[PDB]
């Protein structure tokens, strides 16, 4: 049977033929893969067959060559490379012959060519392919279908290869693409294909784009496809004009003036969505780049050096043309709309915010007449645009000249938060929240403070799109009032602030807002919970009985949720359930951090029982395990030495938190809990530590866990050394050998993503050495004789700190910890350290570099270390 009829049966709507034909096609692919590929190439290359059979034939080739999973893609390319070169040449010949042999415009042959080339361009087994594609494009003898399919094949290729291989062949495919993108081609499909191809073929064209006469031609040819009547060509040309601005800043001085400005402005004023969107996005990218350049221009000027790259100030020069368009675009809003739908009106606000943070104090005289004339206007789009345009400009300029505007703008916004239209109410709530966030003392001012609280408490009950915006305003207002009172109230904690007369009922309305049935819309439940955490954390000493009430209510809810787990049936049930448990655990943490100890003793047993039950019954899912461990850590920290009554029931869960190394965040939380646990319990951690050290050494032994877990284990070894003291000698030799092996490791300098890890591990090793020295030293007025078990290692430690002292690139925590270790070694032993420290000068360099640094703990620890060293040296 011919395979053409099998493909035609596979397209057919009846599954009784479809499943049998599909299984025959699969058995043909299994029985002999290259013969099946050869026969499908013979089917594809024939102009006489039906187009449906040819496309169905090409589908199998496209599926065989490429896939979305990368390891499957790798072994698919490997199984292509295992076939004999003559049969591969046969299918290469037929697939390359197929281009131009189809009258339809979507074609499978271009993607077949792309998959074939992606499988074997890194091994140079097809040299003819690039000259054939370039020759097909460059030939003046017509055939528009062939030219379109070749340009689409080049564009398909340029997005799938690793760019380091196409850097060899970047001179010829650019010639083909720019030949195809020129203005004299009559077919607009060819122009569209070449314009979509150049957007991919851009990252590895750096040597072409660096040469002046080539980049002039590329910019001139891209600047012609923005004037095409096809509009898809217009969108595709603006879309890579944006990318050229993003990647090749500091080349754009020649073109930005007498070309790109007019193109982008005229694109902004269009009445088509996808054409105005790119004109907005171009200037948004300009505002990103010109802020990064200013950051580096300040950073290099602090050290007195000129910066690497200077800025050109395009966005500051384009303000008076950009702002009257950006304000006007904000009114283009529909009477019914969706929240997640990106549109030009939604883009103009983000561009205005970025323009505000970039240009700073100069943006306000261009925006302020718009708000002034459209705050009072009987049309909801212009009023909503005025409120949004007022709320965008807050983060930019100087607050000292920005607060008199909002002082007299507050009574308008108080009225405007009770508008007939929902959209104006939502925008008014957002601007009030930004007023609380950025200019906090202008909101605390008691002329408008009580009506503002009345408006927010009323607006907590409204539509779900505006209650969520109200909640963040509450969260900001609590911190503003707490910090304003904390300046006044002396030493510890404020006794009475602005919101203590109204803390009750605010807390009650938040507890009502939590239990809404429509809480799944617009993050309502989670935003109410975050507001509740932020209000409980920043409470005064006056508000404590309300905190008692909230603690009772929260523990009641937490006891309810533990019975709810069996009523779960679907995936969305688990998705909402895990969010509810995470929010309850974080709220319990913020409650436990605030309650007094005499009241914290009373809730502790039911808190640990509920945390233990939610650790047991839940089938992993990661996040609840992390949150349970962190909640237990804060409970340990607040309870102190009284925690040990719960220890023996907690020990197997601590063990299984350490033993399970599949997820690294739960074991990171476990080792942080081990550090907090030993730091709290001090000398009583003796009978539990053997399993802990064995599990930590086993976790050090494995070679496929994540790299970030490894720095923490050495630090908690230092912590358990400090907690134990004299009984650490049975682990001392083992941990010293592991510290030697850890310090003897090194890694390459070429990437900062490895240099940062090297610095982190160095800090961890130094902390472990300080921990073991201070643990063996004892707490008495004279040093214990057990420190002399470390005395062969002092030359090794001094060579290690000499080795890190020899490096030229340091995180400041490295020298800050090293100075403390030098001070510990000065206090640890007698005068014998002097003839070792006199031989290495870079530690004496480091003990001055620590004091001249700006980070304070390095200065203090280096001063203490050099004081001990000078005291030792003067006692000759």
């Amino acid at each position: 049977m011919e395979l053409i009829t099998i493909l035609e049966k596979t397209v057919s709507p009846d599954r009784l033929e479809l499943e049998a034909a599909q299984k025959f096609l699969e058995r043909a692919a299994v029985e002999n893969l290259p013969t099946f590929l050869v026969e499908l190439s013979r089917v594809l290359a024939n102009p006489g067959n039906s187009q449906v059979a040819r496309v169905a034939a090409g589908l199998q080739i496209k599926n065989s060559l490429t896939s979305k999973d990368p390891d499957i893609k790798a072994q698919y390319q490997q199984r292509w490379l295992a076939i004999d070169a003559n049969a591969r040449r046969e299918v290469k010949n037929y697939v390359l012959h197929t281009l131009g042999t189809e009258t339809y415009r979507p074609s499978s042959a271009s993607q077949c060519v792309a998959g074939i080339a992606c499988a074997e361009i890194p091994v140079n087994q097809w040299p003819e392919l690039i000259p054939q594609l370039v020759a097909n494009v460059t030939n003046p003898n017509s055939t528009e279908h062939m030219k379109e399919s070749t340009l689409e094949a080049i564009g398909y290729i340029c997005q799938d290869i690793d760019p380091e291989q196409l850097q060899d062949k970047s001179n010829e495919i650019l010639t083909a693409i720019i030949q195809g993108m020129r203005k004299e081609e009559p077919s607009n499909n060819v122009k569209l294909a070449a314009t979509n191809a150049l957007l991919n073929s851009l990252e590895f064209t750096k040597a072409n784009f660096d040469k002046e006469s080539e980049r002039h031609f590329i910019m001139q040819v891209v600047c012609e496809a923005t004037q095409c009547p096809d509009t898809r060509v217009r969108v595709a040309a603006l879309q890579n004009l944006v990318k050229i601005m993003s990647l090749y800043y500091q080349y754009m001085e020649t073109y930005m003036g007498p070309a790109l400005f007019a193109i982008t402005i005229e694109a902004m004023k269009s009445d088509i969505d996808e054409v105005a969107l790119q004109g907005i996005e171009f200037w948004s990218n300009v505002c990103d780049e010109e802020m990064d350049l200013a950051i580096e221009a300040s950073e290099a000027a602090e050290q007195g050096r000129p910066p690497e790259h200077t800025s050109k100030f395009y966005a500051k020069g384009a303000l008076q043309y950009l702002v009257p368009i950006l304000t006007q675009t904000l009114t283009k809003q529909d009477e019914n709309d969706d929240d997640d739908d990106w549109n030009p009106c939604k883009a103009a606000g983000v561009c205005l915010m970025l323009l505000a943070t970039c240009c700073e104090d100069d943006i306000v005289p261009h925006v302020l007449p718009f708000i002034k004339e459209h705050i009072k206007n009987p049309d909801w789009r212009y009023r909503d645009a005025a409120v949004m345009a007022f709320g965008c400009i807050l983060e930019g300029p100087e607050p000292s000249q920005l607060k008199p505007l909002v002082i007299q703008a507050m009574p308008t916004l108080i009225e405007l938060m009770k508008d007939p239209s929902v959209v104006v109410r939502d925008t008014a709530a957002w601007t009030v929240g930004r007023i609380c966030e950025l200019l906090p003392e202008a909101a605390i001012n008691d002329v408008y403070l009580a009506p503002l609280l009345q408006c927010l408490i009323e607006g907590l009950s409204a539509e779900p799109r505006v209650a969520s915006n109200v909640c963040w305003a509450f969260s900001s207002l609590a911190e503003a009032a707490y910090e304003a009172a904390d300046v006044a109230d002396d030493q510890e904690e404020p006794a009475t602030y602005c919101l203590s007369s109204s803390f009750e009922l605010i807390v009650q309305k938040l507890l009502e807002t939590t239990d809404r049935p429509d809480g799944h819309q617009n993050n309502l439940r989670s935003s109410a919970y975050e507001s509740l955490m932020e209000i409980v954390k920043n409470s005064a000493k006056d508000c404590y009985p309300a905190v008692q009430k909230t603690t009772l209510v929260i523990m009641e809810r937490l006891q309810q949720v533990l019975q709810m787990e069996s009523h779960i049936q679907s995936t969305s049930d688990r998705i909402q359930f895990n969010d509810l448990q995470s929010l309850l655990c974080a709220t319990l943490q913020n409650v436990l951090r605030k309650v007094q100890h005499q009241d914290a003793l009373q809730i502790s047993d039911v808190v640990m029982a509920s945390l233990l039950r939610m650790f047991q019954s839940t089938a992993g899912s990661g996040g609840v395990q992390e949150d349970a461990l962190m909640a237990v850590s804060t409970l340990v920290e607040v309870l102190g030495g009284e925690f040990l009554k719960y220890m023996e029931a907690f020990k197997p869960f601590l063990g299984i938190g350490l033993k399970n190394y599949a997820e690294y965040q739960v074991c990171l939380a476990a080792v942080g809990l081990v550090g907090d646990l030993c730091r709290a319990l001090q000398s009583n951690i003796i009978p539990f530590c053997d399993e802990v050290m064995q599990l930590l050494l086993e976790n050090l032994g494995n070679e496929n866990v994540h790299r970030s877990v490894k720095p923490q284990i050495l630090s908690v070894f230092g912590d358990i050394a400090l907690a134990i003291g004299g009984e650490f000698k049975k682990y001392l030799e083992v941990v010293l050998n592991t510290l030697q092996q850890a310090s003897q490791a090194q890694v390459d300098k070429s990437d900062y993503d490895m240099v940062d890890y090297l610095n982190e591990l160095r800090e961890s090793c130094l902390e472990a050495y300080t921990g073991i020295v201070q643990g063996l030293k004892g707490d008495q007025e004279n040093v214990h004789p057990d420190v002399m078990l470390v005395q062969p290692r002092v030359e090794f430690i001094l060579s290690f700190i000499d080795h890190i002292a020899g490096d030229e690139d340091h995180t400041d925590g490295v020298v800050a910890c090293a100075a403390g270790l030098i001070g510990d070694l000065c206090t640890a032993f007698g005068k014998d350290v002097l003839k070792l420290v006199e031989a290495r000068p870079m530690i004496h360099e480091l003990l001055t570099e620590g004091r001249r640094s700006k980070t304070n703990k390095a200065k203090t620890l280096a001063r203490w270390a050099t004081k001990e060293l000078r005291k030792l040296k003067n006692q000759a």
Binding site: T138, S170, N171, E172, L174, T175, I178, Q179, N208, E214, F217
Partner: peptide
């Protein structure tokens, strides 16, 4: 004419 090439 193709006129321009990169090399």
């Amino acid at each position: 004419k193709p006129a321009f090439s990169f090399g």
